Amino acid sequence: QISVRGLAGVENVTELKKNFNRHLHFTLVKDRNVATPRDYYFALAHTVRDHLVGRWIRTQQHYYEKDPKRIYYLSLEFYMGRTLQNTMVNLALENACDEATYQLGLDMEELEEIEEDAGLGNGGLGRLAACFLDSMATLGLAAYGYGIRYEFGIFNQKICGGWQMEEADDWLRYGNPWEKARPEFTLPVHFYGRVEHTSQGAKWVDTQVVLAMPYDTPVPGYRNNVVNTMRLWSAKAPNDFNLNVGGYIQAVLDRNLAENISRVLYPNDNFFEGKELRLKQEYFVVAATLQDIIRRFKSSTNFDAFPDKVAIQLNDTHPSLAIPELMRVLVDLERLDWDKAWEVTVKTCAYTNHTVLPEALERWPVHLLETLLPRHLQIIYEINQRFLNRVAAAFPGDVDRLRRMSLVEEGAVKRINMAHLCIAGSHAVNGVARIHSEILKKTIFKDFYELEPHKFQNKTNGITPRRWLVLCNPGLAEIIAERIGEEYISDLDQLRKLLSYVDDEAFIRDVAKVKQENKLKFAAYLEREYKVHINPNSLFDVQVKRIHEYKRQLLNCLHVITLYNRIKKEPNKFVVPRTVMIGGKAAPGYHMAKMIIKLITAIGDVVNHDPVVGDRLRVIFLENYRVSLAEKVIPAADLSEQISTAGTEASGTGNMKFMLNGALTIGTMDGANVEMAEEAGEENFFIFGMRVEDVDRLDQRGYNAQEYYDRIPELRQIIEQLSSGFFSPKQPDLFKDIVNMLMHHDRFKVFADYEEYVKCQERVSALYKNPREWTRMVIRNIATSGKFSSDRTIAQYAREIWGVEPSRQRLPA
Amino acid sequence: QISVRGLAGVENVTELKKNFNRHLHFTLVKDRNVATPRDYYFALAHTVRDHLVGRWIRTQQHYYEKDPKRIYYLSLEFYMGRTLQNTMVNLALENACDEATYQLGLDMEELEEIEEDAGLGNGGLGRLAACFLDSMATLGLAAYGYGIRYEFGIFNQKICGGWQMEEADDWLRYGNPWEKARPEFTLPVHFYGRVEHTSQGAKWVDTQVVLAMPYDTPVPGYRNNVVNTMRLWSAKAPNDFNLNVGGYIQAVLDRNLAENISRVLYPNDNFFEGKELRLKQEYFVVAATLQDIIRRFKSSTNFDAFPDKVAIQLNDTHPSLAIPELMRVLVDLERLDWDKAWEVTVKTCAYTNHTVLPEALERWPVHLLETLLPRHLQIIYEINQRFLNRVAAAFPGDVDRLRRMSLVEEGAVKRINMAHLCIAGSHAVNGVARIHSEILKKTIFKDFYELEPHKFQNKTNGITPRRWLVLCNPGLAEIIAERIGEEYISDLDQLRKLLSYVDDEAFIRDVAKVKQENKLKFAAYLEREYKVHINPNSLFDVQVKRIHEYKRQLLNCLHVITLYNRIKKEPNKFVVPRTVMIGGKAAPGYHMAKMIIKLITAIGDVVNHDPVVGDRLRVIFLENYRVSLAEKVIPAADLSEQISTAGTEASGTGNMKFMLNGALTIGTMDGANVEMAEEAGEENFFIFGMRVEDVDRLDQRGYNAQEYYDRIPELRQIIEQLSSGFFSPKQPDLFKDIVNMLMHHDRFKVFADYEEYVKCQERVSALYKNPREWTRMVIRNIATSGKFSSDRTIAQYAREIWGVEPSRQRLPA
Ligand SMILES: OC[C@H]1O[C@@H](c2cc(O)c(Cl)cc2O)[C@H](O)[C@@H](O)[C@@H]1O
Ligand SMILES: OC[C@H]1O[C@@H](c2cc(O)c(Cl)cc2O)[C@H](O)[C@@H](O)[C@@H]1O
Ligand SMILES: OC[C@H]1O[C@@H](c2cc(O)cc(Cl)c2O)[C@H](O)[C@@H](O)[C@@H]1O
Ligand SMILES: OC[C@H]1O[C@@H](c2cc(O)cc(Cl)c2O)[C@H](O)[C@@H](O)[C@@H]1O
């Protein structure tokens, strides 16, 4: 049907059809009379997978023969989403499979909706890892993603009575056709025990053993025939584990204890929970990965060349134990001296920071590490002593600097600062957006920047234009390719050529048409799957992301209520119609976030059923926000809400997704928003609110929310409505905690940005009244979004951190 | 190479080779440079499996269209062993795959040794179910095996310092290519809760739900293109199971609790352990199976025809809850009246008893059933009341009969006698050998036989000649086929034609040659895999079976010691050389059985290292006895030890395996031994010891072991050796418990059969001195083993219990 989706050749379609029928018969053991739609999905999945294997084998054979420097990307999260459509896109199979299935009497889109998301991440950090894997394969890098194969990913969110309910994401229930178990590469991981010192150094003994079994998933590059590997570890008990009948039966049942390590993803985003099971997960991934790395390195004695052949990227502090584990292996097992081992470690490891929020920083209690990883604690202490000796020599007499920079934090409970460990043991440390990286050098890591300025870098985040344009928005990808060709898909900077079409009436009409089509289709989805009615002609105002106080869904709520109150005051006055969509998951233990979800639904209940409002304002909570839902709602959006308090969102990536898909942005100068506005031009962005400097000034003075309440009558009305029980008539005091936090304990200064936000929102509504100029501004956004391709980000990591040159050259098919 | 293994056609071998390479590439994602021998096994397994699927689909399509009466065989155990070779045998693919793999540079036998046993059973009862499935498919019966998919089967046995150590049988580690998960047929199973009474009968409410997910395994018939299904249930938690972060994480981890139901096989053979987890397993299999049965029946309202379309066979009392569960479904859910429901239940269900040992009888505490299955207890009480009302009318005034026949046993703890339940609710009750079935009518079920004589039947056990001749002993199958053709494989009675070859010198030589080849190969195995040296010219004296006091491995031990003592007394006297092999697993909590294993190894330690003995006597404990080991050792045996105390081994099946494979039998007149001796003629069997009547006479008098000790000097010497520490010099009192049990607490009268046993063993050694007459007696055994084919057994069940006619006709290929 459409050009960018590849060729549907006669020979190809015929071959796909016969292989589909083969899998249905031999693989699924069904025929067309008994087959369920899920059987049809699996038949297709297996058919597409067959096209990967040849390329997968020859890519790994290529790396063995050429022996390039290998990149190891260590992460506790890979938010992959669905794999079927992505694989077709990267292999140029989409139109062929579409034709083949059509001739078989099947609708491919319907089959695509059957695949479960691989939800092995919480949000931004997990999705970044997924985008990065795609870009690394597209840029021909010898890269491996290493993580944990969680049996249960991020929970499925159900809304009951306006409240979030969690249910287990049993994503492996029906099987996963994409993974390949590799039990032959099973490795032992050690826990607990004690340290013995001998003539030949230290020994870690009396340990409990857990097995790490790898599962490999192919990562295809974009039409370059490269297929890289994501290797995820699963926890397995050894067969003599804990080994009377009561005794025997119980010993077998106790195997669950060891295997619980890979059972479940911790569902916290941007929040540190110091639980032992989480620490076990962090060591488990690190210990198994490093053994696998060293094994592969030896199968090429001399560890001097290790940093020339290995790069390890630490995704946040979660895999920080890689540093003392590499030291442990090199010193204790390989018998290298400390200084040489440390040189290798530093040159091998690099660290990416993703946050400045104090509650998100990993600080593990010494007593935990003492019991679980006694040898690693000893290595950490020795690392600390030697590091502080350097600090003392560089800044003699500065005793407070020593205490500030220490990896060991003193107090009620002694803790290890994992961020401090990562800086000490890495040759590079980067933030994820220009303003974020500057904040790191100016504030939390200032002392470290003063000691080693060369170590500190910026790598602004990006998103993959394959999943986040071609896959989710084919209609937009097509109208673009009609004008400038297909080359932009792997060179997103080419979108700048679209600036010469900003006055082209044909193109303006096509951009607006594609958006309208996306909006209509998404409006149908909401009726079909959630029985909700929306006006497709209204402005689609959307904030989708995890529920957090810093992301200020509450500020959005205040604006929504303002619009409702202004309508009730002057009902017969014209307003630009809006559909306000807010979606996202709250961490199960985050009470305030759960209260915010309830508030949103409570507002919808009042607003959506007021006859006076009509279809001029609708408030909808998007249930179970996840990658597959993002792929639907993002192409349908007109307005992207990126309204975190300045200095709190390290980068954001959802912002970049909306920009690429034809939405305009209302946002603070926070994270990547600053660079987005710089690229598009500030006149083509709806910027409002305090800058980081203004937040700082307010904190020095003291933030007093009452001041805003006293001086803004519209704001006072909202607070009085919330307090009195307007949005909860049966439970008048339901929202007392929210009002209290806003009035007395608001770390994120919601009131302080309220006035500017509302006024900026008025400017949005005014522009939307003029479809032609709205669309022209949209075109200027899409055209300047090229910087935010993860291909650019990864090319920067490759050249400036890993010391490898990306390649766009095809491998033979 | 050999005829019975089928044709190796040019077109077939070429097709097998290309499909092998396809699977290696597309399925295993390997090439010939990286492939492990395990990859080669899996490539072959997948290749052979492909040939099953067409037949599997058309068999189940056939049953849908023809709608025959369906046989449901309910068992907690299916001891399947390996599947690859069995599948090749039944499909006539063995020579073709042998040729195909040879041309690929691979040894097929080596690949076959890589497959794990499916060890989902303990011994005789589990293996019987497996043999039965094979025969039901070979006889074209619409039959389904229903059980539990245990994650861990029977433990692997390791011998350390002469002691049994258990380790988890992680048989699914590498995956199981034979099974097909069917999550679409997932069914809910209820536990706990309470009973509410309404206007419309009783309701079972507030229950905990566990999901039952089926996995289907194909069961091929012998060259008839029939492929039946074994459906095994796996336990799964619902997604809202148990559904704060501590709270959230723990709730997910607690899913293990529900899923523990299918985790592990209880490793007791012939022994009742009244544990709650076992009760849950029994209900789980019953509840899911019955829903599946009724679903299939409705997909053909009127339950009058239910018994015409459904037969349920209960394998021992383990699935006895099928009776009250069928009543529950019919009465509570389908709203049938009690009397009509009961009529249907009785006509549907039949019960097979496998034991008379009191410790093996299932008697569940009322308090357990009250908490776990409150509605079923109510139904059981009502069944009991109505049954006892019939007893009271038939035998008026006989109050003690009422108490004896009651399903409810009074005492310290009230219990439900599950055997009594099964008789009441079944239209047929059978024992597993003629003497066993007579013992049932004369002793434990005498009252029930008096009430309903028509209900009681015999069905003598059998074994499948496919696995237990063609598969494990191709050389013997071939020399037989050369003389009488191939028809005997599915009509074992034809072996009688071999009686006309008992004086044929060519055949005599061939039978002896095949045995010698088997012995040599097995002697090599022991060196290669266990570093033990044996004389292949010695008599192979073997007792393989579970370790139990009733099976009297101890009596064997006494004979072994007697031979050793007689050699030490007259060293320069000639004796027929023997290799005594004893193997089998002990239940983990069975202390005495574990002591017997230690005794056997202790005897070996002394005997095997005495220079005076030389290679005239060797004692070897066969580690980890299981189906795959049985297939090796049984064809290599000369003498089969079947020496249980008369009246204790219900049938035995190992006995039949040895008879078919050219070993002579030394045995008591117990279980099937009686019928074996009757078939072959008593002169061709080495019978010794007390008959059942003699045991009874001894019990009436009082068994006094001291009498035998006082009157038999050879026996006295052995006991004094055991007591003084001759077989345990470092631990003189190690075997004190064994001596004590033998002297004071021997339920199985070991001493009473000692004299006759030793004298009978002398007659064996004498015959072995004359190879020609030994072999002629062997031929007379093999020739009369036809009765003990499970094809005969199943044909009898079909005609006399299930009311269906077996068929030998091919389905179209
Ligand atoms: O984003 C994944 C897919 O979503 C599809 C898609 C988008 C929607 O807005 C709705 Cl409501 C349903 C749907 O299947 C798109 O049609 C398809 O082009 C895209 O590839
Ligand atoms: O019983 C299974 C298989 O056992 C094989 C077999 C028998 C043995 O005694 C030993 Cl030691 C090893 C072995 O692989 C037989 O050669 C083969 O004919 C048979 O099919
Ligand atoms: O770098 C990817 C994203 O990581 C986010 C992020 C930071 C963090 O410490 C933990 C998690 Cl789970 C996470 O998603 C940042 O908040 C966001 O600014 C950034 O865009
Ligand atoms: O019927 C098969 C076999 O079942 C055996 C048997 C009986 C029983 O109650 C429980 C188990 Cl696990 C078992 O294997 C009998 O002991 C044996 O005589 C018989 O040959």
> How far apart, in whole angstroms, are the C-alpha atoms of residue B768 and residue B579?
13
Residue A366 φ/ψ, nearest 5 degrees: -55, -35
Nearest CA to ligand 4 atom 13: B125
Using CA atoms, how far apart are residues A336 and A276, in angstroms rounded to an integer? 31
CA B726/CA B728 separation, integer angstroms = 6
Specify burial of residue A360 (Cβ count, 10 A radius: 0-12, 13-18, 19+). middle
Helices and strands in chain A: count of H runs, count of E runs: 32, 25
- How far is Cα A253 from Cα B754, in angstroms, rounded to an integer? 43
A386 is in an annotated binding site: no
Q: What is the dihedral of CA A724, A729, A735, A739, to 10 degrees?
A: -20
DSSP β-ladder status, B180-181 and B163-167: unpaired
Element (H, E) at B531: none
β partners of residue B79: B119
B299 is in an annotated binding site: yes
**Could you write out the three-class secondary structure of B587-632?**
CCCCHHHHHHHHHHHHHHHHHCCCCCCCCCEEEEEECCCCHHHHHH
User: Are the C-beta atoms of A167 and A159 separated by less than 8 Å?
Assistant: no
Which amino acid belongs to residue B91? L
The resolution of the experimental structure, rounded to one decimal in Å, is 2.0
Mutation target vs B (from A19, A245, A265; most B CBs, 10 A cutoff): A245
Q: What phi and psi values does residue B501 have, to the nearest 5 degrees?
A: -120, 5
* A629 CA from centroid of ligand 1 (Å): 9
Cα separation, B177 vs B172, in Å, equals 10
Are the CB atoms for A352 and A455 separated by under 8 Å? no
Query: Do B191 and B224 form a contact (C-beta atoms < 8 A)?
Result: no
Distance between CA atoms of residues A251 and B166, nearest Å: 11
Beta strand pairing call for A415-417 and A363-365: antiparallel
- Burial (CB count <10 Å: 0-12, 13-18, 19+), residue B150: buried
Which residues make Cβ contacts (< 8 Å) with residue A105, sequence separation at least 6?
none
Count how many Cα atoms sit within 13 Å of the Cα of residue A505 in the half-sphere of its side chain. Answer: 0
Q: How many residues does chain B have?
A: 813
The torsion defined by the Cα of A739, A742, A743 and A747, in degrees rounded to 10, comes to: 150
Dihedral pair phi/psi, residue A186, rounded to 5°: -65, 135
Q: Is A146 on the interface with B (CB under 8 A)?
A: no
B452/B441 Cα distance (integer angstroms):
11
Sequence-separated contacts (24+) of A298-304 with Cβ below 8 Å:
A300/A67, A303/A330, A303/A334, A303/A336, A303/A340, A303/A341, A303/A344, A304/A344
How many A from CA of A632 to the centre of ligand 1? 5
Give yes or no for a contact between B672 and B656, defined as CB atoms under 8 angstroms apart: yes
d(CA B445, CA B458): 14
CB contact under 8 A, B183 and A165: no
A401 lines ligand 1 (CB under 6 A): no
Using a 10 angstrom Cβ sphere, with 0-12 exposed, 13-18 middle and 19 or more buried, the burial of residue A619 is buried
Instruction: Report residue A724 as tokens.
Output: 């009195």
Nearest CA to ligand 1 atom 1: A472
Nearest by Cα to B344 from B381, B398, B374, B308: B308
Q: What tokens were used for B503?
A: 């004086």
Q: Is B406 annotated as a binding residue?
A: no
Nearest CA to ligand 4 atom 8: B270
Residues 418-447 of B with CB under 8 A from A: none
A632 Cβ neighbours under 8 A, 6+ residues apart: A472, A522, A525
d(CA A150, CA B309): 45
Across the strands, what pairs with B181?
Answer: B215
Tell me: is residue B298 an annotated ligand-binding position: yes
Within 10 A of B699 (CB to CB), how many other CB atoms are there? 11
| DSSP assignment letter at A570 | S
Ligand 3: residues with CB < 6 A are A 122-125, 128, 269-270, 316, 354-355, 360, 432, 461, 649-653, 671
Is B190 in a helix, a strand, or coil? strand
Query: Torsion angle, CA of B80/B84/B88/B91, rounded to 10 degrees?
Result: 60
Q: Minimal Cα–Cα distance from A615 to chain B, Å?
A: 36
Ligand 1 centre distance from Cα of residue A472 (Å): 6
Interval between CA B22 and ligand 2 midpoint (Å)? 28
B525 Cα nearest atom in ligand 2 = 11
Residue B691 and residue B753 in contact, taking contact as beta carbons nearer than 8 Å? no
As a whole number of angstroms, the longest Cα–Cα distance in chain A is: 90
| Binding site membership of B2 for ligand 2 (Cβ less than 6 Å) | no
**Which ligand has its closest atom nearest to the C-alpha of A439?**
3
Chain A closest-CA separation from residue B207 CA (Å)? 19
C-alpha B451 chain-centroid distance? 32
Closest chain A residue to the Cα of B238, Cα to Cα: A168
B116, B249, B280, best to mutate vs chain A, most A CBs in 10 Å = B249
| B160 inside 8 A of chain A by CB | no
Distance B473 CA to ligand 2 centre (A): 8
How far apart CA A669 and CA A646 sit, in angstroms, is: 6
A556 CA to centre of ligand 3 in angstroms: 21
- CA A8 distance to own-chain centroid: 34
Cα–Cα dist A683/A677, whole Å: 8
CB neighbour burial string for A761-792, b if at least 16 within 10 angstroms, e if fewer: beebbeebeeeeebbbbbbbbbbbbbbbbbbb
Express the helix, strand and coil content of chain A in percent, nearest 5 each: 55, 15, 30
Q: Which of residues 576-595 of A touch B (CB under 8 A)?
A: 587-589
Could you write out the three-class secondary structure of A456-492? EEECCCCECCHHHHHHCCHHHHHHHHHHHCCHHHHCH
Q: Hey, are the CB atoms on B264 and A252 less than 8 Å from each other?
A: yes
- Cα(A528)–Cα(A546) distance, rounded to whole angstroms? 25
Contact between A177 and A23 (Cβ < 8 Å): no
Contact state of A246 with B170 under an 8 Å Cβ cutoff = no
Give yes or no: B354 in active site: yes
What CA–CA distance (Å, rounded) separates B398 from B418?
Answer: 23
CATH 3.40.50.2000 residue spans of chain A:
1-462+790-813, 463-789
Residue B545 is a catalytic residue: yes
Task: Please report which helix (H) or strand (E) contains residue B637, including its range.
Answer: none
Which residues does residue A805 pair with via DSSP β-bridges, in sequence order? none
A650 DSSP 8-state letter: S
Is the CB of residue B25 less than 8 Å away from at least one CB of chain A?
A: yes
Alpha-carbon distances of A590 from A272, A300, A752, B246, rounded to whole Å? 12, 48, 24, 12
b vs e for B762-773, b when ≥16 Cβ sit within 10 Å of the residue's Cβ? eebbeebeeeee
Q: Residues followed by a break in chain A, C–N over 2.5 Å?
A: 243, 300
Residue B5 three-state SS: helix
CATH number for the domain formed by residue range(s) B1-462+790-813: 3.40.50.2000
Q: How many CA atoms lie within 13 A of A790 on its CB side?
A: 25
| CA–CA distances in Å: residue B782 to residues A314, A669, B135, B496, B787 | 70, 92, 20, 8, 11
Q: Pick the closest to residue B142 from B77, B90, B66 (CA basis).
A: B66
CB atoms within 10 A of CB A485: 12
Give the CA distances from residue A525 to residues A622, A632, B660, in Å, rounded to whole numbers and listed in that order. Answer: 12, 9, 68
The rounded distance, in Å, linking the Cα atoms of B116 and B629 is 12
Q: Which residues of B705-715 are buried (b: 16+ CB within 10 A; e: fewer)?
A: beebbeebeeb
Rounded CA separation B140/B696 (Å):
44
3-state DSSP percent of chain B in helix, strand and coil, to 5: 55, 15, 30
Provide the token pair at A546.
């995890």
Considering B231, B236, B354, B749, which one is annotated as catalytic?
B354
Give bridge partners of residue B188 from the DSSP assignment: B211
Q: Is B250 in contact with A266 (CB distance < 8 Å)?
A: no
Q: From the CB of residue A146, how many other CB atoms can be counted at a distance below 10 Å?
A: 27
Minimal-distance CA residue of chain B relative to A37 = B184
CB of B412 within 8 Å of any CB in chain A?
Answer: no
Distance CA A386, CA A425 (A): 11
- Cα atoms in the Cβ-side hemisphere of radius 13 Å centred on A329: 21
The answer to whether domain B463-789 has CATH 3.40.50.2000 is yes
Closest CB from A50, A247, A260 relative to B26:
A50
Helix (H), strand (E), coil (C) string for B300-353: CCCHHHHHHHEEEEEECCCCCCHHHHHHHHHHHHCCCCHHHHHHHHHHHEEEEC
CA dihedral A368, A371, A377, A381 (to 10 degrees): 80
Separation CA B297–CA B294 (nearest Å): 5
Are B672 and B685 in contact by the 8 Å Cβ rule? The answer is no
How many Å separate Cα B45 from the centre of its chain? 25
Q: Looking at beta carbons, which pairs linking A616-619 to residues 24 or more positions away fall under 8 Å?
A: A616/A538, A616/A567, A616/A575, A616/A577, A616/A578, A617/A560, A617/A563, A617/A564, A617/A567, A617/A575, A617/A577, A617/A578, A617/A580, A618/A534, A618/A535, A618/A538, A618/A578, A618/A579, A618/A580, A619/A560, A619/A580, A619/A582
Tokens of A138: 């597209």
Which residues of B are less than 8 Å from A268 in CB distance? 245
How far away is chain A from the Cα of B269, in angstroms, using its nearest Cα?
Answer: 12
Q: How far apart are CA B650 and CA B356, in angstroms?
A: 7
CA B404/CA B800 separation, integer angstroms:
29
Q: Which experimental technique did the depositors report for determining this structure?
A: X-ray
Q: HEC string of A111-163?
A: HHCCCCCEEECCCHHHHHHHHHHHHHHHCCCCEEEEEECCCECCCEEEEECCE
Query: Considering only CA atoms, which of B725, B708, B753 is closest in space to residue B602?
Result: B725
Give the residue whose CA is nearest to atom 12 of ligand 4.
Answer: B269
Q: Burial, A410: exposed, middle or buried (Cβ in 10 Å; 0-12, 13-18, 19+)?
A: exposed
The two three-digit tokens of residue B734, written as one number: 């190690």
Q: Positive or negative CA dihedral for B48, B53, B58, B59?
A: positive
Sign of the dihedral defined by the CA atoms of residues B530, B532, B535, B541, in that order? negative
Task: List the 253-272 stretch of B: residues with Cβ below 8 A of A.
Answer: 253, 255-256, 260, 263-264, 266-268
Choose the mutation target among B25, B28, B29 for the interface with A, i.e. most A CBs under 10 Å. Answer: B29
Q: Which of A265, A267, A268 is nearest to A232 (CA)?
A: A265
Which of A26, A36, A170 faces B53 most closely, judged by CB atoms?
A: A26
| Spatial contact of B91 and B51, defined as CB atoms under 8 Å apart | yes
- Asked if residue A64 belongs to a known ligand binding site, the reply is yes
C-alpha span between A72 and A294 (Å, rounded)? 12
Tokens read off for B340: 């009509």
Q: State how far the alpha carbon of A253 is from the alpha carbons of A63, A237, A241, B122, in Å.
A: 42, 11, 10, 19
β partners of residue B187: B212
> How many other C-beta atoms can be found within 10 angstroms of the C-beta atom of residue A105?
8
Cα–Cα distance measured from residue A83 to residue B462, given in angstroms and rounded to the nearest whole number: 52
* Strand A143-148, strand A156-160: pairing: unpaired
Cβ–Cβ gap A266/B275 under 8 Å: no
- The DSSP bridge pattern shows strands B428-431 and B349-352 to be parallel
* Total number of residues shown for chain A: 813
Q: CB of A447 within 8 A of CB of A406? A: no
Q: Do A168 and B264 touch (CB under 8 A)?
A: no
Phi then psi for residue B688, to 5 deg, are -145, 165
Residue B710 vs residues A346, B308, B555, B715, B724: alpha-carbon distances, Å: 83, 63, 18, 9, 18
Distance from chain centroid for Cα B158: 21
Closest-CA residue, ligand 3 atom 11, reads A270
Q: For chain B, count helices (H), then strands (E).
A: 32, 25
Nearest CA in chain A to B47: A26
Q: How many alpha carbons lie under 13 Å from residue B465 in its C-beta half-sphere?
A: 27
**Count of alpha carbons within 13 angstroms of residue B763, beta-carbon side:** 16
